[PDB]
């Protein structure tokens, strides 16, 4: 009862005459809704991961996956090890997040150089063949390739770069094979000292150790922007409710509030809206394309007017900023009172 | 000559956390800042009158 809440706030068993601010009241949510895109196909994940004929480190292939459904549960079809590090996002069953645009890169590198595929690393591969940005968001997957990339004489189809003029900007591809002159002389010759051909093969032989074993690596680069989200995950939709408190998941955006019809002149390109406080205030349903206004559930402060406990025990309650009709009646439990 | 000033009240949980419950659970673990802030604001409000 209000008197006991006043006692708990004051940390005393006896209260004097006055008015005390105890706590706040707010209407607790009822249902749950989820609206996600309507696409039903599946993303070309199986045309990059397996990829019988594969790519080299200095000409790494790039695939642009768009307008499909992403299921990251179907990845456990390979031998273990599956090193597997996601930066800026966790993979522990977080395939429930929509995404703007996804890049897939793939290359084979050596054993000890798998650690070089990470932000803030300096090394031969890091500054000569492939460099991630400092604030990169995405995932890196690595696995062994002895069973599929082994040959008796060693495969020369795999090469890497050791010498170049300077470092690489993030996500930059170099294919040039022009000679690299070092000391003073003009070179312009096929071979000779200071006249270097900037490519060296791996020569992978099964007789080598684990640290020399070929490793195949795939890198997924994600993007989060103010876009309709093309790619997404397998989350079922749900009929939307209006004029009624409801926690919602609109295309990856979680919130809680009363969703109503809005009459704000959204232009065709505009996706959502914001207010003075830099918060979401209007959203477009990505199945009916209707603008909806968001307004949180009623809330306010509660005060207890009481004479001294030595005088009586009955109290009065003041709800601050409420029009005496928005005072909730409650059904079983929908108030923090 | 000015005499009085506008009386303001601040709700901790709705400002810091908002519509998140786990944030409130973590916020329970950072002491009694909210009691101090609410008490100071109430003192100013009474002083104005």
């Amino acid at each position: 009862d209000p008197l006991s809440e006043t006692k708990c706030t004051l940390k005393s068993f006896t209260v004097e005459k006055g008015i005390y601010q105890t706590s706040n009241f707010r209407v607790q949510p009822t249902e749950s809704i989820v609206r996600f895109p309507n696409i039903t196909n599946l993303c070309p994940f199986d045309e990059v991961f397996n990829a019988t004929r594969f790519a080299s480190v200095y000409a790494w292939n790039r695939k642009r996956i768009s307008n499909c459904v992403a299921d990251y549960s179907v990845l456990y079809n390979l031998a273990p090890f599956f090193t597997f590090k996601c930066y800026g996002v966790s993979p522990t069953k977080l395939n429930d997040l929509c995404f703007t645009n996804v890049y897939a890169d793939s290359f084979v590198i050596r054993g000890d150089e798998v650690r070089q595929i990470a932000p803030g690393q300096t090394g031969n591969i890091a500054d000569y063949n492939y460099k991630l940005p400092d604030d990169f968001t995405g995932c890196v997957i690595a696995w062994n390739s002895n069973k599929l990339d082994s040959k008796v004489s060693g495969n020369y189809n795999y090469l890497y770069r050791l010498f170049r003029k300077s470092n690489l900007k993030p996500f930059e591809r170099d294919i040039s094979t022009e000679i690299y002159q070092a000391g003073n002389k003009p070179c312009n010759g096929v071979a000779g000292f200071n006249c270097y051909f900037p490519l060296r093969s791996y020569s992978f032989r099964p007789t080598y150790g684990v640290g020399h074993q070929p490793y195949r690596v795939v890198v997924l680069s994600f993007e989060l922007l103010h876009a309709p989200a093309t790619v997404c995950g397998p989350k079922k939709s749900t009929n939307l409710v209006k004029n009624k408190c409801v926690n919602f998941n609109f295309n990856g955006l979680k919130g809680t509030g009363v969703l109503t019809e809005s009459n704000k002149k959204f232009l065709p390109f505009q996706q959502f809206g914001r207010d003075i406080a830099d918060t979401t205030d209007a959203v477009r349903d990505p199945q009916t394309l209707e603008i909806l206004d968001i307004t949180p559930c009623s809330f306010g402060g509660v005060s207890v007017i009481t004479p001294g406990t030595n005088t009586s025990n009955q109290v009065a309650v003041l709800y601050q900023g409420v029009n005496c009709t928005e005072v909730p009646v409650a059904i079983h439990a929908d108030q923090l009172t | 000559l000015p005499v009085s000033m506008t009386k303001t009240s601040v709700d901790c949980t709705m400002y810091i956390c908002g519509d998140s419950t786990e944030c409130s659970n973590l916020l329970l673990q950072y002491g009694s800042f909210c009691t101090q802030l609410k008490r100071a604001l109430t003192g100013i409000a009474v002083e104005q009158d």
Partner: peptide, 28 residues
């Protein structure tokens, strides 16, 4: 008369303004 949506935006973040005890008529 010489001294004079933002209020709603402030209120939705937990910042409210309380009324005075004495109205203008009483001061007058």
């Amino acid at each position: 008369n010489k001294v004079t949506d933002l209020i709603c935006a402030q209120k939705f973040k937990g910042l409210t303004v309380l009324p005075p005890l004495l109205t203008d008529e009483m001061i007058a």
